[PDB]
Design a protein around this ligand. Sequence first.
Ligand SMILES: N[C@H]1[C@@H](OP(=O)(O)O)O[C@H](CO[C@@H]2O[C@H](CO[C@]3(C(=O)O)C[C@@H](O[C@]4(C(=O)O)C[C@@H](O[C@]5(C(=O)O)C[C@@H](O)[C@@H](O)[C@@H]([C@H](O)CO)O5)[C@@H](O)[C@@H]([C@H](O)CO)O4)[C@@H](O)[C@@H]([C@H](O)CO)O3)[C@@H](OP(=O)(O)O)[C@H](O)[C@H]2N)[C@@H](O)[C@@H]1O
Ligand SMILES: [Mg+2]
Ligand SMILES: [Mg+2]
Ligand SMILES: [Mg+2]
Lengths: 219, 226
Amino acid sequence: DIVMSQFPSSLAVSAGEKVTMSCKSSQSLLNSRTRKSYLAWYQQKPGQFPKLLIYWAATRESGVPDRFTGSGSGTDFTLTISSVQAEDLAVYYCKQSYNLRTFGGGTKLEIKRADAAPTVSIFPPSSEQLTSGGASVVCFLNNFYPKDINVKWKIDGSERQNGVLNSWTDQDSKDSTYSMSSTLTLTKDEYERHNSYTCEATHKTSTSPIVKSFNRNEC
Amino acid sequence: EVILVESGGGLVQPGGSLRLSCSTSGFTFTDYYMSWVRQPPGKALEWLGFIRNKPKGYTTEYSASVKGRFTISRDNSQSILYLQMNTLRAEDSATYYCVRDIYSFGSRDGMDYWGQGTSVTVSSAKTTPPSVYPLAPGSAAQTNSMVTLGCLVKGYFPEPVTVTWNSGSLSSGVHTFPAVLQSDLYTLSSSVTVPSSTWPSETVTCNVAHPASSTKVDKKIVPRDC
Ligand SMILES: N[C@H]1[C@@H](OP(=O)(O)O)O[C@H](CO[C@@H]2O[C@H](CO[C@]3(C(=O)O)C[C@@H](O[C@]4(C(=O)O)C[C@@H](O[C@]5(C(=O)O)C[C@@H](O)[C@@H](O)[C@@H]([C@H](O)CO)O5)[C@@H](O)[C@@H]([C@H](O)CO)O4)[C@@H](O)[C@@H]([C@H](O)CO)O3)[C@@H](OP(=O)(O)O)[C@H](O)[C@H]2N)[C@@H](O)[C@@H]1O
Ligand SMILES: [Mg+2]
Ligand SMILES: [Mg+2]
Ligand SMILES: [Mg+2]
C-alpha cells in the first residue's frame, strides 16, 4: 500500500497572501509510460463536501480559479494558492490514484484578520424548558477575532463556574470571524431561587468586559 | 447536472450491519467507476473502495481497512450504488460519501462529483429525539437596531441535527454552534440576527431536523421571553 502524508498540519495567512503546502507519498506515483504522476488535490470548506481542484499533479479542473496551482512528481508534491481569499478557508487533501486510492491527512488553512469585538446577547431559559424541570441561560458572542475569549457567569453577584459549557463555530467563510455560545444549565428550582444572571465577555479588543444580564424578577 | 444522493445512514448497534444507497442522475452511470469515501467527525477523508465501469466489467476493490467487511455493488438499470457494511464498530462512525470516479485512464482523473453524504453512528446508546426551545430576548431591549434570536436543541442522539431558520430564507446572519455530547446526549444552539423592523412584526421560525428519529420540529420565536 502507499502511505500519503501532508505538511504542515495547519497554516495561517491573511487575505492577499500566498501559501504553499506539501504532500508526500511512500512510493512513486509516476507512470513511466505516460510520464504523469497520479496525485490530486481536494478542498473541503468547513461543513461541506470536498471539491476536486487538481488532478495528474498539475492539471487544474475546469472552473477552478487559477489561484490554485499544483506541482511536483514522483513522491513530492505541492499545492500553491496565490492571493488567498477569505473563502479559501478549508482543509486541503491530497490523494494518490496510482494504486487504488489513498488520501493524505490534510492541511487546514486558517485565515488571519483584524481584531474585532464580539456582539453579546443574553437569553433567559424558555418557559418551555422550565416545564421539563431544566433551566439554560444562554449567551451568544458573535463575529469576533481572535478566537481566544473568556466568559464569566455571575448569579446574584457571585461567580458561577459549574455547569457552564462553551462552544465555538468554525471560522466564517466570508468574514473570517468566530462566534461562540456560553450556556449555563441549572435545574428549574435553583434557577428560581436566584435573581440576577449575568454573562461577562473579556476579549483582547478591550480592557473592560462586555456584560449582559437580566433580573428574572423583572421578567 | 450531475446528482449523487446518499441515504441509509442512521444509528447502528455495535456488531450490527447497514446498507447505504446512492441514487444518481445526470450522467451515464455505467461509463464510470464509482467510489465510497468516509469521514469521521473532525478527521480525514478515507477511501473505502470502488466498483469499476462497464468496459472493465464492474469489478470491485477495497481498502485494506474494510476489505472483507464492506462490499460495494451497483444496479445498472436503476443507476444506484450501494455499500453493504457488516460487523460495525465505533471506529466506523462517520459521514459516508458516494463519489463519481474516473471513466477512463487516459482522459482525466479525480473524483469530480460528491454527494452530500450520510451520517452513520455506531453506538449502544438509544436514539433520542430532541427538545427544541425558542430563545427570545428577555424583557429588556437596550440599544436596538438589530435583534438576535436563537433556538436551543437539547437532549438528542445521535448526531446530526439540522437547523435552518425561515426554511433557509434567513441564511447569513445565522450561526449554528457545534453540538456538545453530554453523557449519551447532545445539545447545540443556533442564533440568527435580523433588523428589529423584521421581528417581531414578521415571523421567524427555527426549523430543526433529526434524521435518526425521523423528526422535524418548527418553533416560531414569539416575543416575551422572561
Ligand atoms: N484487461 C486489460 C489488460 O489486458 P491484458 O490482460 O490482455 O493485458 O490490459 C490492457 C492494456 O494493455 C496492457 O497494459 C499493461 C500496462 O498498463 C498500463 C500502464 O502502463 O501501467 C495501465 C493500463 O490501465 C488501464 C487501462 O486504461 O487499460 C486502467 C487502469 O486503471 C485503474 C484500475 O482500475 O485498475 C484505476 C486508475 O485510476 C489507476 O489507479 C490505474 C493504475 O495506475 C494502473 O496501474 O488502475 C487498470 O484498469 C489497468 C489494468 O489493470 C491493466 O491490466 O488498465 C493501460 O493504460 C495500459 C496501456 O493501455 C498500455 O498501452 O498501460 C501492460 O503491462 P506491462 O507490465 O507494462 O507490460 C500489459 O502488458 C498490456 N497488455 C487493457 O486495455 C485491458 O482492458
Ligand atoms: Mg498539504
Ligand atoms: Mg484513504
Ligand atoms: Mg480485481
